[PDB]
Amino acid sequence: FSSRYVDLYGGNMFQFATLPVYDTIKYYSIIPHSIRSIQSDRKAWAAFYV
Amino acid sequence: SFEAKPSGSVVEQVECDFSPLLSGTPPQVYNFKRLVFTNCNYNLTKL
């Protein structure tokens, strides 16, 4: 579900895509992401909440 | 009730392939694999 596709300002969630995974998923894991930039180039990033 | 008779009906109305199921070794009943088809035309007579 993506809010941006239908109501980005509202934040309401509307399904935009379906993935055909027959097996159930019982484990989820966050992936850390790094930005390769010089000290001046470094910028603050928004904090995701789950 | 004297309900009015139905009149002026208005009707508002892809091709998923079943070849993978019939092609190659079938998975065993223990190792069964489901196949999901959505928004696709289907031929029940063909199978």
Q: In the PDB record, what is the listed experimental method?
A: cryo-EM
Q: Would you call A22 and B38 a contact, using CB atoms and an 8 Å cutoff?
A: no
- Which residues, 6+ apart, have CB-to-CB distance to B27 below 8 Å? B33
CA distance B27 to B30: 8
Residue A24: CA count within 13 A, CB half-sphere: 1
Q: Would you call A20 and B36 a contact, using CB atoms and an 8 Å cutoff?
A: yes
CA distance A41 to A34: 13
Residues of B engaging A, defined by a Cβ cutoff of 8 Å: 33-34, 36, 38
Structural contact between residues B40 and B46, judged by C-beta atoms closer than 8 angstroms: no
Give the resolution to one decimal, in Å. 4.6
Q: Which residues of B13-38 are buried (b: 16+ CB within 10 A; e: fewer)?
A: eeeeeeeeeeeeeeeeeeeeeeeeee
Please name which of B34, B41, B44 lies closest in space to residue B14, comparing C-alpha atoms.
Answer: B41
Q: Round the CA-based radius of gyration of chain B to a whole number and report it.
A: 20
**CA distances (Å), origin B12, targets B8, B9:** 13, 10
Q: Would you call B34 and A18 a contact, using CB atoms and an 8 Å cutoff?
A: no
Q: How many CB atoms lie within 10 A of CB A6?
A: 13
First to last CA, chain A: 14
Six-digit token string for A4: 């941006």
The alpha-carbon gap from A6 to the nearest alpha carbon of chain B, in Å, equals 21
The alpha-carbon gap from A22 to the nearest alpha carbon of chain B, in Å, equals 6
